[PDB]
Write an enzyme that holds these catalytic residues in place. Structure first.
Site, PDB file in Angstrom:
ATOM      1  N   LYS A   1      52.504  -7.066 -23.031  1.00 53.18           N
ATOM      2  CA  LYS A   1      51.540  -6.282 -22.276  1.00 53.18           C
ATOM      3  C   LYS A   1      51.710  -6.673 -20.812  1.00 53.18           C
ATOM      4  O   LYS A   1      50.904  -7.414 -20.248  1.00 53.18           O
ATOM      5  CB  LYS A   1      50.107  -6.555 -22.752  1.00 53.18           C
ATOM      6  CG  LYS A   1      49.728  -5.784 -24.015  1.00 53.18           C
ATOM      7  CD  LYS A   1      48.367  -6.210 -24.575  1.00 53.18           C
ATOM      8  CE  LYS A   1      47.455  -5.021 -24.869  1.00 53.18           C
ATOM      9  NZ  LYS A   1      48.179  -3.944 -25.563  1.00 53.18           N
TER      10      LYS A   1
HETATM   11  C1  LIG Z   1      47.599  -3.054 -26.455  1.00 49.32           C
HETATM   12  C2  LIG Z   1      48.540  -1.936 -26.972  1.00 49.32           C
HETATM   13  C3  LIG Z   1      48.511  -1.414 -28.276  1.00 49.32           C
HETATM   14  C4  LIG Z   1      47.518  -1.843 -29.342  1.00 49.32           C
HETATM   15  O1  LIG Z   1      47.744  -3.157 -29.784  1.00 49.32           O
HETATM   16  P1  LIG Z   1      46.499  -3.952 -30.421  1.00 49.32           P
HETATM   17  O2  LIG Z   1      47.092  -5.388 -30.567  1.00 49.32           O
HETATM   18  O3  LIG Z   1      46.254  -3.355 -31.760  1.00 49.32           O
HETATM   19  O4  LIG Z   1      45.363  -3.939 -29.477  1.00 49.32           O
HETATM   20  C5  LIG Z   1      49.400  -0.451 -28.633  1.00 49.32           C
HETATM   21  N1  LIG Z   1      50.326   0.017 -27.744  1.00 49.32           N
HETATM   22  C6  LIG Z   1      50.375  -0.471 -26.480  1.00 49.32           C
HETATM   23  C7  LIG Z   1      51.433   0.092 -25.519  1.00 49.32           C
HETATM   24  C8  LIG Z   1      49.486  -1.447 -26.087  1.00 49.32           C
HETATM   25  O5  LIG Z   1      49.518  -1.945 -24.811  1.00 49.32           O
HETATM   26  C1  LIG Z   2      45.685   1.326 -23.305  1.00 45.82           C
HETATM   27  C2  LIG Z   2      45.620  -0.200 -23.406  1.00 45.82           C
HETATM   28  C3  LIG Z   2      45.553  -0.795 -22.008  1.00 45.82           C
HETATM   29  C4  LIG Z   2      44.364  -0.590 -24.210  1.00 45.82           C
HETATM   30  C5  LIG Z   2      44.380  -2.011 -24.801  1.00 45.82           C
HETATM   31  C6  LIG Z   2      43.399  -2.226 -25.939  1.00 45.82           C
HETATM   32  O1  LIG Z   2      43.539  -1.555 -26.990  1.00 45.82           O
HETATM   33  O2  LIG Z   2      42.496  -3.071 -25.785  1.00 45.82           O
END
Ligand SMILES: *Cc1c(COP(=O)(O)O)cnc(C)c1O
Ligand SMILES: CC(C)CCC(=O)O
Ligand SMILES: *Cc1c(COP(=O)(O)O)cnc(C)c1O
Ligand SMILES: *Cc1c(COP(=O)(O)O)cnc(C)c1O
Ligand SMILES: *Cc1c(COP(=O)(O)O)cnc(C)c1O
Ligand SMILES: *Cc1c(COP(=O)(O)O)cnc(C)c1O
Ligand SMILES: *Cc1c(COP(=O)(O)O)cnc(C)c1O
Ligand SMILES: CC(C)CCC(=O)O
Ligand SMILES: CC(C)CCC(=O)O
Ligand SMILES: CC(C)CCC(=O)O
Ligand SMILES: CC(C)CCC(=O)O
Ligand SMILES: CC(C)CCC(=O)O
Lengths: 297, 294, 297, 294, 304, 304
Positions: B147
């Site tokens: 992320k």
């Molecule tokens: C944060 C995110 C997700 C979801 O991941 P979780 O761990 O389930 O919150 C999916 N795709 C992207 C591009 C993300 O940044």
């Molecule tokens: C679109 C993403 C920045 C959201 C992250 C989350 O699901 O918390």
């Protein structure tokens, strides 16, 4: 830290210490900012900013890619850029305008955050040649990241490539596109020379450099034939010369790529001539190129 | 944003004081990493969902950028629990962020280490998707398993496009033309009783995706992991997406083509409800995923 | 010409001679049609149509990809398909349902032409193995043409590949995807066998074959291990066996690819066993698979 | 469609009689080729624009499919002139079509040769585009230099998507991510006084595109041929598209981002007007492009 | 190289006589196929590891080039056993090679059939010690992508293929690493210049799918061993950052055996040294190839 | 091959002595570089065509592999002239080759430097007559794509590269064609297995961009000749169907000279036989290489 001094913050200058933004700013989390790199050079008639209007035009063009609204007229930004030089008593400096999405909300969609926040900061500012290494990170495809704009997030790709190149012992990285062709440096456009002809790389997924544009005009004025082509890494390995261009990089000769010497292994005559005319131009010593300069005083 | 007290590199400060230099590397070059974590109200107070898994990914994302986080995971975990407590939150969204500061503005971020860190939080028919004209980045272009702030320019462009077209969310394909994921959600589809989770490809390895797969298997569903095309989704009985913010969201239409009955399906609705029961502490089998703040 | 006889035309049967459509039909100009391939086999209890509901479901699924509206309920089409067999006195035949955009207008957008016209026609209907040659035409990427649907226009790609294969002296073409991996035949799904394990190719950009599905179930019932994988041309060259599946192709062993013999150079035991059980199934000789048959009488 | 008398394999027949078997290969497999030709009214009667160039492409498209057209080009040219005359048309659209018939339905079309042929005709702020989620086919997937029927499933999908999103036309990218063309139009853009025509890449070599380039050069404009990205178009002073049906159409917005002033630009409007003057016989320099039916 | 007696198309000759024309098709166009086989000393004499599997691949590689090997597999197998015996070797590396000769130099190699064949073997100069194994190998992702499946035959050990491996290896070494990690053209991890890759995460062992990589016999052996030890093994496609965050990463190959990877692109993997899983798999693999595992004796061919 | 006296790393030796170890790195890994040069007989003796340009490319190819050629370009040039003289050849094909030797067989070739070098030459057995040239070559598009620019060095004549050419050529011949037409991975036309491509449409000659192809010296020569004759020459990227509808198509190469292409994928090009432009260019090119064109004498190096 950076010695910027007085920074223009959304309409007014404030001490560097006061030039801060919320850590909840959309751009700090999602790369939703746009910026420019502009230089001022000292001349016999005082500091001169190089191709200011072209840089400001691109700044607004970059914002349009993100559907970002800049709450100032281009003319206002141009005045702020001139003032950041004047107010700080700078002569030869690097100017960094930045527009970023603020802290109104943190949904991925940046539209609710408009208009963008804006600031302008500045700070006072060959034969061996630079050594490059081809990166394992490819410059993003044209439908993945907006490569014609200076969008903040784009530079994660440049950062990864630059770190890799430096770690490998090189000065800069040479990125290929996903198809395997040469793209550009982490922050410079590329050129090569073979059998007397200057080859500028096609724009492909690269930024349309203003320095690149300037060097092509200079090259033609000097009588050199210039061709725009797609190139492979081995076409560069066999070139007589290779050089890079950029506002920060000016015109930089490349003497080696992937530990393979380019031509004689040192800066070539063509790149050196282009660099010299370019430096004469930005310092107000070329009457024919005065149109490119904006004198602060 | 009503964040209140924000943890800033070791200590809590009022939201208004949580600011950073406009010369910060991350503000110019996207060199930041973040997480999305949720706390849900339970009979025993607020419970953070899979805290350690999120913290692990936070540090993993930092490693991708060779970013140094000047705090031990245990310290950040305590800060995250405290941002909930000190603000009196019950059901909230927690946003940890590490970013490269203002030591210099060369593209290389190494001279800027260590990163600055902050933790903020704020109280917290089927979706219609449209396939985006922006492709999710190849695995050698941007680090899709992390992320990283800069990555989200791609998500932002796709999301804006989807909303402008009249949809709720974007469905991004990879450069080769296969389905990747939503702008911020992992994708699943159901066909003839079988649940299909998409392979990781260039997508983020979602913690909600992982949670949903475990829940689905525990409920007795057969789960397969595959690569999928847009038309495999068009013909699916159901399609749904997962994410910390999105929880489990049913998808009723894609590219103006109804999915199955054109409304939220039974599998997606059931997984969403059981997931909500898990995060609110109603299912003993999943208590291991919860960290009670009180 | 084709001996189809009575053809179902938008609700009623008419002589083949009367089964015509305007040359201004959108589908004749832009490939905007969808079709199916269904077979009926003679059994001890009369003609039996194989997996009729699965084929009709895919027919409507294909229409959805084009946002094409079929003005008949699936049940009506199923009855028409049974009747095209009965009314023509067919026993073992090939059934071809077709839905196409008519002549209301010729703008590229087919929506103004809805609802689609529909017709159902039918006509009466190994050890050496088939010889394939890898095509110079790649199966379309998943975001170029809808490869999971039987859309008319898609078959220009199949036609080009098939013509090439036949011209080269082969029986069928093997298409690769744009990335270079094996995709499928011009009209058949592919499988290969190595060290006792049956490898079905992933769906990738291929059509999800009903024959492929049937063969996988049969294989598992016979005790064979089945794995679904991505494959390269040279993985096929080194396989013990290679075979293709399709409604028209049934289960066809492949003895050679690109003039390189597969295994012993003749049909292998695994492909032959699967073919035999499949043929026993479609002819009503396998009680455990009777659910797949729809008896016309 | 008010076509009237249609030329069918050698002779004109009433529209109602212009039908073909539903077992025709082309109706099932997209194995047809066609052209789009226009006739404009002039002071000397109807004039067909670049007839021979269109007929040449028609036969060229047939060669790609190894389709045999059982008529000499001269015969088709006469048929095209006659479809205009016999129907009393002045300003009309002419649609020649060659398709594989009903001899057999094996995917291989060779057994179906020769093709059947027909010729029909009927009286005849800036556009807003949205980039499509469908990519124009690679050069080794579908023959992009030919007007082959099957090719248009790709155009149809993109056009429907654009219209559903609220736009007038779709802008398709190639699989690599570069701009290709519209669903049925070639693209151009203007920047700093220079006109940029897109390279042929996987696009059709438009006759209108060719005409526009010649006109632009004759008017004194500098014309360059390049590969372009979507954001090069976003920042252009002008963008416009060309095609027989589209003539020269200015593009005022792409992906909800205004192009230049956000309205039709001077270069596109001028090229369109001079093009109209050329096709209506007002410019002697371009008379060679006209075939007067009377 | 100290090879000694080399088998040349049917008979052993001194190394000095094991030469071929400089006009040989394979020296100009990469039209050769080879194998990497090892004999490990045991208390019962040298044992060749998975000989028949290597010989089968040798002939499979030849088929890809439509190259005709004028010897039956059994003849080659005997020659491989004899090259060890005749040179009095205990442990050694064995290199069979089939190449297109000097009949003509048109790019088409068919007129040059049948191929010439040779089998040579030589001893190891040194081995990595446990200290080095534990420190682990350092990899750097290459700027050279492994060839697409319709560009070069990646499932075969064809000579020309290794120009790609050579370029990647030189680059990695020049950058200060031990080995290169190549990605495929799409950007996913492929394999090393001459090794297959594996990674471990949350207790599960992940072998990479075959994609455009060679189907390694060591990879196959390691998967069997891992499963026999009770480990869960999954086969997946992976990205560079999935490896960056793995608990462990390791590579396999005849020459590489099982080698732990402690760092990729200057980013430490897990603890930054070899992990317990890779070290355990390496130990059991070595026990197997040296004849200390009864359950794996079927993989060994004793020369004596 | 009847080569006779071959130059081997500094001195001429009988063909029988021009052999190298079967343990040579290049025989196993494709690590060699070569050139294709021709000497054409004239009334003033044999004349080598564009010798310095070929030698420059030879050293450029070596640089791509980081291969060290232990001879100065001038030494190689003298050896190339001498191989013609010493064998008493008039017209002949000359094949310089530099390859990595048998010092070691690790994939990394650096430990094997410097490279071994040889220069051999031989006479042509037969030539195509005007009848065959006019009928034109028949091409078929290959199922093998020319390698991406980051997979194999397409601007260099590196041995390993030709496995791709060999596979494509065998496929084309098996399909009944004379030569293969390879596309790049993206689907655009690249080049033949060993020839660059050109096409003619509406009076304009179109040379294909370099893309992933070798920068042919014959291609360069033909472009210069075409321009000198008054033809307009443009350089573009092309698709298979742009060639199908061209008025003419032709290919160039040292061995192929200028060869008209009359059919591609069973679809006739233009009139279905060689066209006037290709035939004219071939004639002027032949006049140039055989010393009948004063304006092109600068391209010739007379051995006598
Ligand atoms: C944060 C995110 C997700 C979801 O991941 P979780 O761990 O389930 O919150 C999916 N795709 C992207 C591009 C993300 O940044
Ligand atoms: C679109 C993403 C920045 C959201 C992250 C989350 O699901 O918390
Ligand atoms: C800014 C930049 C350049 C150089 O452009 P100039 O206008 O010459 O300063 C080159 N590449 C990238 C990626 C850039 O961001
Ligand atoms: C119809 C078809 C198949 C075979 O599918 P079945 O359902 O088994 O008949 C395979 N490939 C293509 C391209 C097809 O159109
Ligand atoms: C017909 C067509 C055009 C326009 O070509 P013109 O010759 O100018 O009519 C452009 N693109 C496609 C895909 C077309 O079919
Ligand atoms: C030989 C080889 C390997 C290792 O395979 P093993 O059968 O385990 O020796 C891996 N990759 C490549 C490219 C190889 O050539
Ligand atoms: C040698 C070669 C050519 C022809 O180049 P010339 O310099 O004209 O001989 C073309 N393509 C390839 C792949 C080649 O190796
Ligand atoms: C890559 C960019 C951060 C550099 C801008 C400049 O050349 O000033
Ligand atoms: C390729 C398709 C036309 C064949 C359908 C079938 O197998 O019946
Ligand atoms: C969209 C295309 C079918 C239109 C052809 C024309 O411009 O006439
Ligand atoms: C890459 C190959 C040259 C190595 C074979 C081996 O592992 O023995
Ligand atoms: C493809 C190469 C082997 C041919 C070199 C030549 O044209 O002489």
């Amino acid at each position: 830290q950076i010695k910027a001094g007085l920074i223009w913050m959304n309409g007014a200058f404030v001490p560097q210490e006061e030039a801060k933004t919320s850590v909840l700013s959309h751009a700090l989390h999602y790369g939703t900012s746009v910026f420019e790199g502009i230089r001022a050079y000292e001349t016999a008639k005082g500091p001169a900013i190089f191709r200011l209007k072209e840089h400001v035009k691109r700044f607004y063009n970059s914002a349009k890619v993100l559907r970002m609204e800049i709450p100032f007229a281009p003319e206002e930004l141009e005045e702020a850029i001139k003032e950041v030089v004047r107010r700080n008593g700078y002569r030869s400096c690097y100017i960094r305008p930045l527009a970023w999405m603020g802290a109104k909300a943190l949904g991925v969609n940046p539209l609710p955050n408009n208009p963008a926040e804006v600031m302008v900061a500045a700070w006072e500012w060959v034969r061996k040649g630079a050594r490059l290494i081809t990166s394992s990170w490819a410059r993003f495809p044209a439908n993945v990241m907006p490569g014609k704009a200076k969008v903040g997030g784009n530079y994660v790709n440049s950062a990864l490539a630059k770190m890799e190149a430096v770690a490998a012992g090189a000065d800069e990285a040479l990125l290929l596109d996903e198809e395997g062709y040469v793209a550009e440096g982490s922050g410079e456009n590329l050129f090569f020379v073979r059998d007397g002809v200057i080859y500028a790389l096609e724009h492909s997924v690269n930024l349309e450099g203003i320095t690149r544009d300037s060097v092509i005009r200079i090259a033609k004025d000097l009588g050199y034939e210039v061709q725009v082509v797609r190139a492979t890494r081995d076409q560069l390995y066999m070139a007589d010369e290779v050089f890079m261009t950029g506002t920060a990089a000016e015109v930089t000769p490349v003497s080696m790529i992937d530990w393979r010497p380019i031509g004689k292994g040192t800066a070539g005559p063509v790149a050196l001539r282009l660099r010299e005319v370019y430096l004469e131009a930005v310092t107000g010593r070329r009457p024919e190129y005065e149109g490119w300069l904006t004198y602060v005083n």
